[PDB]
Amino acid sequence: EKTAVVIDLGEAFTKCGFAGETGPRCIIPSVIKRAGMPKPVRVVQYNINTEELYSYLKEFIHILYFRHLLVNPRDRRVVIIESVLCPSHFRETLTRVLFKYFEVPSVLLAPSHLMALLTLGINSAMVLDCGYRESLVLPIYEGIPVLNCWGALPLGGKALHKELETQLLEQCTVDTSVAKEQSLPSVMGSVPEGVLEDIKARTCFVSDLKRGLKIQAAKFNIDGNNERPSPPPNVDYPLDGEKILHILGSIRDSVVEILFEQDNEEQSVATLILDSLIQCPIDTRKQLAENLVVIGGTSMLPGFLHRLLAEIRYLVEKPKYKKALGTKTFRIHTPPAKANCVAWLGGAIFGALQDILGSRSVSKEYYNQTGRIPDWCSLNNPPLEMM
Amino acid sequence: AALVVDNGSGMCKAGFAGDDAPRAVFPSIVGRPRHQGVMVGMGQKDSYVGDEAQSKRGILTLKYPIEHGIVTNWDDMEKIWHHTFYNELRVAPEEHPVLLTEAPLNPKANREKMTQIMFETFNTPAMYVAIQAVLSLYASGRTTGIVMDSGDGVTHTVPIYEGYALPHAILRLDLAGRDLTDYLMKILTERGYSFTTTAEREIVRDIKEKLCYVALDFEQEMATAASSSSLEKSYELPDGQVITIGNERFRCPEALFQPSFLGMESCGIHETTFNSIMKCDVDIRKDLYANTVLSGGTTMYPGIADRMQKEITALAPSTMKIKIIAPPERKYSVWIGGSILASLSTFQQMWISKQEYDESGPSIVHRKCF
Amino acid sequence: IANQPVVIDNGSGVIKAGFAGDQIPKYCFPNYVGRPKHVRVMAGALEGDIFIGPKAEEHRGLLSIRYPMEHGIVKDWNDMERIWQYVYSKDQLQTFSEEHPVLLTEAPLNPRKNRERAAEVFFETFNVPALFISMQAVLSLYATGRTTGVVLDSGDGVTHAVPIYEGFAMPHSIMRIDIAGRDVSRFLRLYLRKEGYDFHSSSEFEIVKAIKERACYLSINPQKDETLETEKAQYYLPDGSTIEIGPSRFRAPELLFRPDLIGEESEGIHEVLVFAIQKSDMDLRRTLFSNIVLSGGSTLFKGFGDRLLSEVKKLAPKDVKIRISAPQERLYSTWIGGSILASLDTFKKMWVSKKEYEEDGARSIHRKTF
Ligand SMILES: Nc1ncnc2c1ncn2[C@@H]1O[C@H](COP(=O)(O)OP(=O)(O)NP(=O)(O)O)[C@@H](O)[C@H]1O
Ligand SMILES: Nc1ncnc2c1ncn2[C@@H]1O[C@H](COP(=O)(O)OP(=O)(O)O)[C@@H](O)[C@H]1O
């Protein structure tokens, strides 16, 4: 039998490929590219007239299949959820576009946090999955994932662009093609995201905490108490337009301090795991502390994890979680496959799943008969097995 | 070749006749997961039993099929026996005859359904039900004397003289180990440490077994416990969290001697033994005072014998000598009796065969009780 | 001192203040402290770092809400003292705590340290002439004006059912569950995110509560309303933006009657009522079914009484009259009860003086509680 397909889903939109582990991971960032449109158009929007979407998936799907991957779509169907929280559109719509445009011969749909543990051989919690927005923490038990201890933040990195557009604009020399120093704004009213990104992609990094905090002291120059150290060296970014964007070495340092500010807001990038452990059964915390899993492209941001853990550990001493939990370590389990890759692999794994797959799958027929696909959030999930 | 299988509400003690200790000892519990419509991972069992249910407490809803020594859910009870025979013992029920245990003054429906399942479902060659209190005498090798076999479901006192039972003297009390656990949860919550869920109930039961002891003088011990913080001990939970039980440590087991605390509106376990002896013949009372046996695992509280001695002595005549028989191995005293009885060549005649069941019916169990 | 007592309802959601002479609570404000979201080191920003009631409502978008009380238990005492200081402020009531006595409404089955510490505050921090803690369920019966009656008090923090007959509260039949109005708001926020509306900030949690309070109906048949296409009723925010609630409106509160659906190990709101009655004596059970009183704020849901009556009828015995007598002022019933109790001449004996507390100690509050 032929296995299997893997879908774009967020930072993940770039994750087009097909099973097994050998597939290309074709990079689609994914947009249309419709001629009459300003390009590109991101067609990946919630709260969208579905029609608009309809026509978009139709066309994307058509496209991806059409070209991009050899697919011969009638034989392989997988939809990964990288969402649990996807609203019913568009899922309804996704199916809806199948289904009839695309005749779909049963489909199994599955979440990332389960596809996550598949690789470590671990059937237990914690999974933190961070990438395009809205970040999710979800202890997975052996077996049930447990939603009741459900947590979510931005960003992950979508907001880094405001933080960066802004800051780029708060620094400010562009050395324009006329050798003039000019304002960014106004030579440009905006910085396209691709710039922002590029700059980010290669320039942002996460500092060690003892000094991550002096970076914070720059904001807070209290009564002169600043102990924000000299920045690294400045960078001439060449900018397109035959412009040069000079960048302070100091921004590399600040952008990443969003992730980590403590306002009167909780420092949540850092909890999540902590606000959930307090929520979790005591009888399982023993596994959850200690056994942590981090997937998602944004943890490719270097030094992230350093702090991260330091922070967390740091925080474990805040009484509030301390008295509440007592302490212990944390150990990271990590695959060797890259952070982005674990969803993708656990999609490959799934071809193994063929004896099961067509069983735990939602039938085409059913759907043809009702068209109802269960949601965990519905009062009528039909027992599909009636069929 | 025969099997002894005690059908305890708390723990299932199973093994082969002639053995010293039971081969398979596991909790008699079924754990079904709180599964939502969200997809679950692989290696998922619809219903877990015994050590597996105790390991996965977090998600599993633990439901005891036996309530006050009565089988409420028979379908789950069959799954306990199925795990006992096929998995734990690694023996076919068709091969060996099975010796079963019943509490005294139980509903007639239990014996009727019990025999039907073993002969029809499991197709056992023979099955004999025995009284738990009677078996405990074989473990001690004593024909005369009263037994206080206190279980998780119920507590009963059955006086037997020279191997002759006084049915009118038999007393049953619904107060047992499981009710004490629920009482401990409530008073710990008043202290500060809150325990609500089924998984937490089992953790509090494990805490109870370690810390709790019987006081000789309840009022004097609480007065001293209030004054000094020497009795106060710490306990480490599965989580890093540590708890200090305080005065509630010895307060839980008091309910056995004063049921008014739980609100049972009944006499204490020491009063039940005395009341049973008073219902007994005047001549044999002397021997019952001389041979007061304590059986079951609910009498494994440190210093229960000391409190019992004082209370019974106060009730009993001043001239009479009161001797309490409390052997180190009380927990497995009922099963050991079953093993000794099953081993005895005389008992070979007492077995009810499949042929006898088919000819007579399920009513045969009622005729061959006593 | 002869001066009129000040009734204060210790509601996790909204604190209700006023005098025993008052027919209704004049002063009702949310039970939380509002601080600025950004940690302000510089001058020219919001001064005081404390906003309570209308001050919090004014600067709602700027401030960050933190409730000091969770499930009827005080986590941060410093914040609660500031809230109680706001009760005895120039803004609300405008009177001396040294002159007027106080009546508190503590939740049932709380830790003893919570009760002792709460009393300490009003005698040590405040120099109160007299203090008396009363039971929320008992006060509701004074408000209704009947001695006998089951009180199903579904609050924001805690839901508890106390059966009381002829002014006798059965302490063994009392049942308490932590799944209350606050949890429904948390579950609705999850369902609204599943509709595609994020409420990330603590300020946006109040808008989820506002949506629930405005538009939330309990369906008699959930499968018919799930199958039927909704009108998708739009709610308007202070900014002017609209939100389409749709099926989330009625399928959110379902977890009160069916908390196993999401995966919360509890009996349910309809179950706790029935079990609490079943615990009582056979003679009283029929009278308790015929006399049920709804209390608390989480009964104001549209079609609550209709759904509850149906769910109780199926569990309750056949051919029994079930009368659920709901007042129009369920939300404000508890405070009115306190005002009535304080007004009674019997109360004069009930409260404990500051001088008695100084001499006797902390234990005083426990003995006079009941
Ligand atoms: N050392 C101990 N300290 C305190 N309580 C104990 C101790 N040992 C047993 N218990 C209590 O006694 C109960 C039953 O004892 P157990 O050891 O289960 O014997 P059992 O014969 O299996 N009871 P049953 O399940 O009816 O057969 C337990 O659930 C505990 O509450
Ligand atoms: N009209 C309403 N419709 C639905 N829910 C409501 C309504 N009014 C209040 N609530 C809910 O009930 C809560 C109020 O609880 P309340 O009665 O003040 O508790 P307490 O008895 O502890 O003071 C609110 O926070 C909200 O969750």
Quick take:
This is part of a larger assembly, with chains A (387 residues), B (370 residues) and C (370 residues). Chain B is built from 14 helices and 19 strands.
Characterization of the model:
Chain A: Belongs to the actin family. With 387 residues, chain A is of the alpha+beta class. Chain A contains 14 helices and 14 strands. In chain A, the strands form 4 sheets. A 5-stranded mixed sheet of chain A has the order 8-7-6-13-14. A 4-stranded antiparallel sheet of chain A has the order 10-9-12-11, with no helix packed on it. In chain A, strand 9 (174-175) and strand 10 form a beta hairpin. Chain B folds into 3 domains: 1-132 and 334-370, ATPase, nucleotide binding domain (Nucleotidyltransferase, domain 5); 133-174 and 268-333, ATPase, nucleotide binding domain (Nucleotidyltransferase, domain 5), CATH 3.30.420.40; 175-266, Alpha-Beta Complex (Actin, Chain A, domain 4). Chain B is built from 14 helices and 19 strands. Chain B has helices spanning 51-55, 74-89, 108-120, 132-140, 177-191, 198-211, 218-227, 254-257, 269-279, 285-290, 304-315, 333-343, 354-360, 364-367, and strands at residues 3-7, 11-16, 24-27, 30-33, 48-49, 60-63, 66-67, 70-71, 98-102, 126-131, 145-150, 155-161, 164-165, 171-173, 234-236, 242-244, 292-295, 324-325, 352-353. In chain B, strand 12 (155-161) and strand 13 (164-165) form a beta hairpin. Chain C is flat. Chain C folds into 3 domains: 1-136 and 334-368, ATPase, nucleotide binding domain (Nucleotidyltransferase, domain 5, 2-Layer Sandwich); 137-178 and 267-333, ATPase, nucleotide binding domain (Nucleotidyltransferase, domain 5, 2-Layer Sandwich), CATH 3.30.420; 179-266, ATPase, substrate binding domain, subdomain 4 (Actin, Chain A, domain 4, Alpha-Beta Complex). A 6-stranded mixed sheet of chain C has the order 3-2-1-8-9-17, sandwiched between helices. In chain C, strands 10, 11, 12, 13 and 16 form a 5-stranded mixed sheet that branches. In chain C, 38% of the residues are buried. Chain C starts with 5 loop residues before the first strand and ends with a helix. Adenosine-5'-diphosphate binds at residues 9, 11-14, 155-157, 181, 185, 209, 212-213, 216, 296-298, 300-301, 331, 334 of chain C.
